[PDB]
């Protein structure tokens, strides 16, 4: 996984309500394999369910998303996982909610 990407600039502040790692997909309602968008904090399902986060990427252009299953961060432009100090706050808030 990459130690930086040129899309980390689009990672936005964490809502003061925090994150709910059990939040369902905003399109289909599935509780399985959701991701949270690190720009707008909408929650959509992964590619193996109904691909709604991929659809969100395409209709918004938002680059980076966080898995509620393992707290990895994927960039859809770089087609890679990324970790950087800029992702620790959001990973830590999700880790606290999850565990
Ligand atoms: O939309 C999702 O399923 C999330 C983005 C994601 C995460 C890991 C990937 C690995 C290989 C190919 C595509 C990936 N996409
Ligand atoms: Zn969905
Ligand atoms: Zn978004
Ligand atoms: Zn990137």
UniProtKB/Swiss-Prot annotation:
Transmembrane segments: none annotated. Zn(2+) 1 binds at residues 5, 7, 75, 78. It is found in: Cytoplasm; Cytoplasm, Cytoskeleton; Nucleus; Perikaryon. Residues 46-48, 74-81 are annotated as: Ubiquitin binding. Induction: (Microbial infection) Up-regulated by the presence of SARS-CoV-2 N protein during viral infection. The SARS-CoV-2 N protein enhances HDAC6 stability during infection by reducing its proteasomal degradation, leading to elevated HDAC6 levels. Zn(2+) 3 binds at residues 37, 40, 56, 62. A zinc finger (UBP-type) spans 3-99. Histone deacetylase domain 1 mediates the E3 ubiquitin-protein ligase activity. It is linked to Chondrodysplasia with platyspondyly, distinctive brachydactyly, hydrocephaly, and microphthalmia: A disease characterized by chondrodysplasia, severe platyspondyly, hydrocephaly, and facial features with microphthalmia. Bone abnormalities include a distinctive metaphyseal cupping of the metacarpals, metatarsals, and phalanges. Affected females show a milder phenotype with small stature, sometimes associated with body asymmetry and mild intellectual disability. This is Protein deacetylase HDAC6. It comes from Homo sapiens (Human). The lineage of its organism: Eukaryota, Metazoa, Chordata, Craniata, Vertebrata. The gene is HDAC6. The chain holds residues 1109 to 1207 of 1215 of the full protein.
């Amino acid at each position: 996984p990459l130690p930086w990407c040129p899309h980390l600039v689009a990672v936005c502040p964490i809502p003061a309500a925090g994150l709910d790692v059990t939040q369902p997909c905003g399109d289909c309602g599935t509780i399985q394999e959701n991701w949270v968008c690190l720009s707008c904090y909408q929650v959509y399902c992964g590619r193996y369910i109904n691909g709604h986060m991929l659809q969100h990427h395409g209709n918004s252009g938002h680059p980076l998303v966080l898995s509620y299953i393992d707290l990895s961060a994927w960039c859809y432009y770089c087609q890679a996982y990324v970790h950087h100090q800029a992702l620790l706050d959001v990973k830590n808030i999700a880790h606290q909610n999850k565990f």
